[PDB]
Amino acid sequence: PLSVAVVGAGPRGTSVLERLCASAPELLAPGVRLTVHVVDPAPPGPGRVWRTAQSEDLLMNTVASQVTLFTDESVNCSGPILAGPSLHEWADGAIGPDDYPTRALYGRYLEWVFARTLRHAPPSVRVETHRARAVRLDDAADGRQHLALDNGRTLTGLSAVVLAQGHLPVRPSAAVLRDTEHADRHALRHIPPANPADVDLTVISPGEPVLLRGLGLNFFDHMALLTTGRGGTYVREDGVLRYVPSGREPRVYAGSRRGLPYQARGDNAKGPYGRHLPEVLTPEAVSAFRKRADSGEAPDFLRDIWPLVAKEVETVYYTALVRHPDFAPRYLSLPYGDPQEAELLAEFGVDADARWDWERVSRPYAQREFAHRGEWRQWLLGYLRADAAEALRGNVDGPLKAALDVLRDLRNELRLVVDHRGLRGDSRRDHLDRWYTPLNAFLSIGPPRRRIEELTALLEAGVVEVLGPRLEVTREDGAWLARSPDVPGSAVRVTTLIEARLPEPDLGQTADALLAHLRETGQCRAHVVDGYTTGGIDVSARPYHLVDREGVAHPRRFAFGVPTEGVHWVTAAGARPGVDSVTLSDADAVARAVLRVAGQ
């Protein structure tokens, strides 16, 4: 009887299984039975990231109304549209549409979507689940696939295998190994990169000096786990938050290279489905870029794409600032950086001090010097208060946060420009991966406003200190020494060093046994763009056949999501409703390819 396997039962594997069930009546012949084997060491639907047994202190970064695992009539795919509830609709008044759910609540939605998919399965499809890791994949003698699980079971005779493996562990860097050894010699705690939900922070004591190395979304999780996760609470008075200490908190120090907590997301005013529709990086502009990459002269990100992104953002900022119907048609007719930009702005009442400045938004401390810790702290509090107040105006009427939310909305169009070798390799390396991607995350993949208002109260209470720009950490007898070379008096000896970031996708350093096996035996390879090696596993165009060391696309193997980062840009994002989600149309295309390779 026919069999297939899905490796990974997080959102992407669950979505493949829902799309398999949707198309199986059209693409399997009458009377044919298909067994789908679903393999995850975590209960299926939520997988490891969204498991319901995690701490309720940890939040999503997406509003509840924009979280779904179901296709909708906007989605351009070949399988049938099967409407279901968003997290907000399913949650039955437990959460507001513009509020941020707990990660455990998304888990409970995902466990229910999985149980519902088994209830709605057509009679041609039997699902079998396996609480296990897959550790080897091989060709059988007839060309069907063998999948070996770490519980000693082997699945044989498979017509197809889908790898939906998401956020995988990585072997520690040389720096992470030196710091782990230093912790062993001096009885310290070193916590390497990980989902904050997976780390044991109960080993940190009250009053202990702790460095969070990182100021991004992992930082905001550890900030919550070491405060409200230890009996801390907040109270609001005259608009303004105050932190109420439990006495169990450590002394929290934090820093990074840029030295700033990530920007607050503007409060959502676009509803469940609202997206900035591009007027500079248009589908017409994107088609022309894809035509040049196709004919072998790929665009340069900095020369050719960045000026369109910059114009897109600046136009939205100025349009929200000027609020006159005639302004934007006149501004959009001007080329990016033309001298008439400045003169048109002056004519609509915009002074030189309200003008966009990419250098200031990137490093807003760089005009000034800091004489001691105290001057850094007062500057930083002023900066975070202004950030929270811009975010309260929302992502439609607030000019700054409307403009930075363009960067979140444009990801669809940037993916179509840069994915599948749409850039030259040297531009991919030096412009996208080393400059745009980290700036973009700082500006547009930051926390809810509430997290910036909490951090500000923690800074006022002295429970958190941010050390300052260009964080330096050195190993000493009995501690690490952390300082900012831009903030005199910032030096502090800590006894816990937390690397507050996730492992990035890296096939070359993977700690997954299955991909290490495929890499050693020449059955997968790193995606390469003109001599630049990315961290991504190489796949064909949709429906994403796995490509072997010699460049051969496998007919029975497909890989989908985070492990393809390099082929694809910003894979670490769920489906949104009403916007022709590529995550949903990719799941549908992968499911239909699996059913066609089985259904011969």
Ligand SMILES: Cc1cc2nc3c(=O)[nH]c(=O)nc-3n(C[C@H](O)[C@H](O)[C@H](O)COP(=O)(O)OP(=O)(O)OC[C@H]3O[C@@H](n4cnc5c(N)ncnc54)[C@H](O)[C@@H]3O)c2cc1C
């Ligand atoms: C901490 C964190 C917070 C996030 N917050 C948000 C957010 O707020 N909003 C948002 O849109 N996105 C968020 N994301 C992005 C995330 O990438 C997606 O939401 C989504 O989880 C990706 O789904 P996936 O199935 O590709 O990967 P994952 O959710 O990582 O699921 C992969 C699954 O595959 C399993 N697996 C891997 N290897 C094997 C193997 N060899 N055998 C068997 N099973 C295997 C794992 O156990 C895991 O269950 C977040 C990610 C993380 C890590």
Ligand SMILES: NC(=O)c1ccc[n+]([C@@H]2O[C@H](COP(=O)([O-])OP(=O)(O)OC[C@H]3O[C@@H](n4cnc5c(N)ncnc54)[C@H](OP(=O)(O)O)[C@@H]3O)[C@@H](O)[C@H]2O)c1
């Ligand atoms: N709340 C949530 O839902 C949540 C929680 C956690 C994770 N996530 C998901 O996971 C993704 C990654 O989160 P993240 O916190 O890893 O990344 P992130 O949000 O981009 O923050 C990474 C931080 O680490 C610093 N940094 C990065 N690489 C470093 C390195 N090699 N050495 C030292 N410092 C380094 C960066 O600051 P500099 O930039 O100056 O170095 C930055 O402060 C998010 O984008 C999101 O998709 C979401």
Ligand SMILES: N[C@@H](CC(=O)O)C(=O)O
């Ligand atoms: N339209 C086909 C595949 C394709 O040719 O794109 C499908 O039915 O899935």
Ligand SMILES: N[C@@H](CC(=O)O)C(=O)O
């Ligand atoms: N995944 C996209 C939206 C979509 O599903 O196309 C995002 O980055 O938020």
Ligand SMILES: O=C(O)CC[N+](=O)[O-]
């Ligand atoms: O420069 C920016 O990014 C914002 C414009 N401003 O003057 O606030």
